[model samples]
Target: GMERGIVQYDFMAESQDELTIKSGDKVYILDDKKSKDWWMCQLVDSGKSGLVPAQFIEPV
Candidate 1:
């Protein structure tokens, strides 16, 4: 099963392992239990997967 999230900030990826999301960007949550504040997410448009700050995303 997968969850979804909405980004509220304009994020920039610091590394390839992390994902940057713009405001209102939607993504699929592949994993959120690995890190306390980093969730593994996949872009709804590109389907790319990486880590994102939990604070930047709102569960949907």
Candidate 2:
């Protein structure tokens, strides 16, 4: 079903200027455009979903 979004195990960026996210790693991604600088992302382990930085997220 289209509702089932694509599952991502790992996320990486081409430039270090962005940020790095790894499994089990905790990150903060921006949630709002206001004062909030970034949101929270809990990196997941193998076979699981983990939190990641929003800056590297690409629209698929």
Candidate 3:
């Protein structure tokens, strides 16, 4: 994916890799400046749900 986006923080719990997202998707891996390894993200285009470790997605 040649697209680009910014990162933001979310106040949710730490989610694992058990989500059901489509392939070749793009998301923003948010980093909270107040927590330890507390990252989050929102699915690009869908806006259906938020997620953690968004940067760990498949290479597009």
Candidate with best lDDT: 1
Candidate 3 off by > 4 Å:
1-20, 32-38, 54-60
| lDDT tens per residue, model 3, 1-60 | 233344333333355532334445556444334443333445677664444444444323
RMSD to native, candidate 1: 1.2
Candidate 1 overall lDDT versus native: 0.86
- Per-residue lDDT value at 57 in model 2: 39
The model with the greatest TM-score is 1
Report model 2's TM-score to 2 decimal places: 0.28
Give the Å error, residue 48, model 1: 1.7
lDDT of 1 by residue, 18-37 (tens): 98788998899888888878
TM-score of each: 0.88, 0.28, 0.36
| Cα lDDT tens digits for candidate 2, 9-58 | 35564553333355434333323233232323322232333333444433
TM-score of 1: 0.88
lDDT for every model?
0.86, 0.35, 0.43
Model 1 stretches astray by more than 4 angstroms: none
Task: Score residue 19 of candidate 1 by CA lDDT.
Answer: 87
- In what order do the candidates fall by TM-score, top score first? 1, 3, 2
Off by over 4 Å in 2: 1-8, 30-60
